[PDB]
């Protein structure tokens, strides 16, 4: 018998935390936290996505589970080398969160003819799945 205490799994505001911008000119792009200014402001910089080094409000971004090692106050060139070494882009694209964003974009790009093909394929798949149930 050992003590049991449930643990929280919050995403921490820290240097090296990868964030996702949801508002502004850089919406939908990834950036890394470089330094914490105050409770609501941090300095971010994403070079790969073309996000300029800027001080941004924490209400403009969403923290992501990804994190990589990064010295405090690192410059744009240093961030780029660390970002590529950690392969942040590859790890992000492998998550279900990113795939859901990619699927949502694909849904809106469909044409009327392609939507007709989706219905035909869905009915064919439905016939097989319903048969397997019975």
């Amino acid at each position: 018998t050992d003590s049991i205490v449930k643990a929280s799994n919050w995403r921490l505001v820290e240097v090296g935390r990868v964030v996702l911008i949801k508002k502004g000119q850089s919406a939908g792009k990834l950036a890394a936290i470089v330094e914490i200014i105050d409770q609501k402001k941090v300095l971010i910089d994403g070079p790969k996505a073309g996000v300029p080094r800027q001080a941004i409000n924490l209400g403009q971004v969403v923290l992501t589970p990804l994190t990589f090692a990064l010295p405090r106050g690192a410059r744009t060139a240093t961030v780029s080398k660390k970002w590529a070494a950690a392969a942040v882009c590859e790890k992000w694209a492998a998550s279900s969160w990113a795939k859901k964003i990619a699927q949502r974009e694909r849904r809106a790009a469909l044409t009327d003819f392609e939507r007709f093909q989706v219905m035909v394929l869905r009915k064919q798949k439905r016939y097989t799945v319903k048969k397997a149930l019975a």
Partner: protein, 197 residues
């Protein structure tokens, strides 16, 4: 989008929910509110109890049956807040109020239907943690509502029936998901993935 929208009043601030519902009624949407006894009001219990006493002492001096009517039920308290946000003395206002139903608990006509929530009026999303709030069911009892225990007993019976339905539905969902899982990696499945579905 639904012809009838059923709102679960649990965990909703009364004033913010009332403003949302009043606008919906005037736009031509039918609304049904259930579990009105679980509504929340910002502020501690004593403050809201004091406020109702100020409401209780207002009445016509020469005839008490002419003055303001003080309804004690949780559903009618929410109705009072809602009627104040509608021009109820007009034909347009009367027609809007006929599109609304408020109940304590979940009556049989709606216990098998889908219930939604209003995020703008949710207490957990609006009030800062640590702020005091009052439950409408407890407030109504202290001012003369008689049917708190009856509703509580009926709600317990409904939850037992609802739990059995969910257990049966959950088992069926697991079987359906497995059928879809084993139907993947086929030619049809690959084509659907390329198109987003």
């Amino acid at each position: 989008v639904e012809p009838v929208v059923v709102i679960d009043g649990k965990g909703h601030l009364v004033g913010r929910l009332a403003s949302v519902v009043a606008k919906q009624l005037l736009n031509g949407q039918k609304i049904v509110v259930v579990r009105a006894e679980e509504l929340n009001i910002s502020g501690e219990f004593f403050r809201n109890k004091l406020k109702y006493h100020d409401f209780l002492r207002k009445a016509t001096a020469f005839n008490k049956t002419r003055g303001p009517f003080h309804f004690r039920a949780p559903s009618r308290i929410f109705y009072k807040a809602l009627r104040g946000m509608v021009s109820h003395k007009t034909a347009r206002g009367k027609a809007a109020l006929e599109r609304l139903k408020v109940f304590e608990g979940i009556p049989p006509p709606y216990d098998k239907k889908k219930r939604v929530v209003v995020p703008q009026a949710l207490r957990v999303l609006r009030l800062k943690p640590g702020r005091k709030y009052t439950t409408l069911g407890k407030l109504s009892t202290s001012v003369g509502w008689k049917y708190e225990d009856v509703v509580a007993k009926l709600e317990a019976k409904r939850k037992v029936s609802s739990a059995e339905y969910y257990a049966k539905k959950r088992a069926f969902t697991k079987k359906v998901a497995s059928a879809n899982a084993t139907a993947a990696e086929s030619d049809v499945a690959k084509q659907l993935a390329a198109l987003g579905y």
